[PDB]
Structure 1
């Protein structure tokens, strides 16, 4: 049995890795991955064109890095129709020119982009700088650190496992680059920092995994619908998602009643609000990122994380779920939902990746 303590003071999870490795890598993976190619999930809405609101740049750019960081914006004629049906259908419900257009994630896997050096380092510094809570002055929450660190790790993991290994003037080979993984993660080479960083990825992973288990209800109500064009998979996909959320629930994970997601009024609230606040800044930050694929996955993976927390805060709010009625109390836009499973999906992939790495490193 796993066990997570998120009091805010010292936050951590005592939990066997083989347990998660085994669970995630074999129980969950092929099916989630299946779901993430589902029509409903390959297409994410995003405004990639907002300008940086904290400084200027584009100075210097390297030429191939803009070539790697460029989002393939492509979209089939049919899909083009298909999104309106969504906008439309989606309009007629809970709904509190957006140069946000839908992007195809399968056309845009997260891998090595050549994004590096000062421009990246700055963004990271600024993201971590956002760790700042009322316990009115800043306190750092360890949770935030570990969350963000886990995310950063998942990424450096993806770029590691999905590196552009060879670029003949003809052919391009993408794959696992051990030396990178190792330079960035090996315990010795990093004086134990990498392992920590990996322990942090897992933290994140579990958080999102809990966030999923605690959100199962919202999908259980048969007025909820993964609306796309057809109805068959819309239901096939519906049960899919569900048996996944069911699997997540199966996983023996427990939290200390101490967790600052407990509704101690103002504390829980202030905190929740401190959070949603911080992630908005973060999203804003992504608007200062020139690796457009990086920027995309940034937005995505963070919205997802915010959403996860949103759930993790709405313990109660969800516990009184209109089992037949439509959920006014709590809600999730398509945008958020896509981001939720997707964010979880890259962390889920990252975890998988670590195993490949173990296996190659033998």
Structure 2
């Protein structure tokens, strides 16, 4: 139903949002090169690759190991500057008067160029990918009795499903032609993973709205976090420009059941998203990267929607101001993946059409 509204909203914003995301302020993400998979899991390529291609047939430089690796030359040393670790509060000086101070405990953290490391088909899959998605869905268990118990599990599942579908949609749009050696849409794959499962398409639009509602809820309390940055002076404005075009009646609906969830159920829900931790179990480097960015994006969104819910102007202003640049980056980059996933659906529907 409301599908059309989000599509309208998304088309009016696709360009501005893509430009914003390529800015120096949003183009980099802090990622710990060392990973601690503490939840364990199949490790051999024999069970980590997708059957979609007959790999033994393709050239070496087209194997999942290369398709999913970073573009070496695309990651500067991090924590050499604590900019990403600072609060929006403290990016610019509001009046004449942090990676350690704010908890970024990364062994060997680095800044990866997301513009040079887009999410796309990598060939990752098999039992491993299956074991991971499986564990996330199976970790949808809250404290029984608690008010809004059911609702909490429905939202958790839906968010994960939309995240899952968004990736599937993505690897489908940006698929590799093992003959032309060109990246191009793969309608058949889209149809097999997302196309023929309405609920999965719905969940992406669910995630799209959840994240868009968060950006819209913080807009009024955003600190003037960029006027001082000589390079990124306009970023804050350019973000307001996007967020402002996001207003929709859909935001009236309590998407994450904030007004129906126990105050402890809300923390459990926040704790489940942990989902960000399993991401370190993802052996495909680019998948880990974007997985981590999106899970952090959702966890950020949940925090915003849950906390700002109880309101209190002083508090609201604090909640958004004490949000870290790292979180805002994750949040807006997650919105960027959703925006593109929604666009890709419309493309595939029109592609599925010309097929006749």
> Fold conserved (TM > 0.5)?
yes
- C-alpha separation in 2, matches of 1:51 and 1:163: 30
1:95 partnered with 2:102: yes
Corresponding residue to 1:251 among 223, 248, 251: 248
Asked whether the equivalents of residues 218 and 321 of structure 1 are also in contact (C-alpha less than 8 Å), the reply is no
Asked whether the equivalents of residues 195 and 201 of structure 2 are also in contact (C-alpha less than 8 Å), the reply is no
TM-score (norm 2): 0.81
CA 1:247–1:83 in structure 2 vs 1: closer, same or farther (change >3 Å)?
Answer: farther
- C-alpha separation in 2, matches of 1:57 and 1:29: 38
- C-alpha separation in 1, matches of 2:132 and 2:6: 31
Alignment match, 1:211: 214
Asked whether the equivalents of residues 85 and 102 of structure 2 are also in contact (C-alpha less than 8 Å), the reply is no
Asked whether the equivalents of residues 165 and 175 of structure 1 are also in contact (C-alpha less than 8 Å), the reply is yes
Asked whether the equivalents of residues 150 and 202 of structure 1 are also in contact (C-alpha less than 8 Å), the reply is yes
CA 1:87–1:179 in structure 2 vs 1: closer, same or farther (change >3 Å)?
Answer: closer
SS state at 1:101 partner: strand
Paired residues for 1:103-252 under 5 Å: 103-135=112-144, 141-167=153-179, 172-187=181-196, 194-219=197-222, 221-222=223-224, 224-225=225-226, 230-231=229-230, 234-248=232-246, 250-252=247-249
1:22 partnered with 2:8: yes
SS state at 1:103 partner: strand
Question: In the TM superposition, what whole-angstrom CA distance separates every residue of 1:20-67 from its partner, at most 9, and x where no partner exists?
Answer: 112212x11100011000101110001142132122653346671111
Number of paired residues?
A: 324
Paired residues for 1:236-315 under 5 Å: 236-248=234-246, 250-256=247-253, 260-262=257-259, 267-280=261-274, 282-315=275-308
Corresponding residue to 1:46 among 18, 31, 56: 31
CA 1:167–1:47 in structure 2 vs 1: closer, same or farther (change >3 Å)?
Answer: farther
CA 1:328–1:152 in structure 2 vs 1: closer, same or farther (change >3 Å)?
Answer: closer
CA 1:256–1:358 in structure 2 vs 1: closer, same or farther (change >3 Å)?
Answer: closer
Alignment match, 1:190: none
SS state at 1:45 partner: strand
Asked whether the equivalents of residues 108 and 293 of structure 1 are also in contact (C-alpha less than 8 Å), the reply is yes
Alignment match, 1:6: none
- C-alpha separation in 2, matches of 1:295 and 1:18: 32
CA 1:73–1:276 in structure 2 vs 1: closer, same or farther (change >3 Å)?
Answer: farther
- C-alpha separation in 1, matches of 2:195 and 2:336: 24
Structural RMSD (CA): 3.0
Q: Which runs of 5+ in 1 are unaligned?
A: 1-14, 188-193
Alignment match, 1:12: none
Question: In the TM superposition, what whole-angstrom CA distance separates every residue of 1:77-129 from its partner, at most 9, and x where no partner exists?
Answer: xx669962736976399836631211110111001010112111111100111
Alignment match, 1:354: 345
- C-alpha separation in 1, matches of 2:28 and 2:5: 32
TM-score (norm 1): 0.80
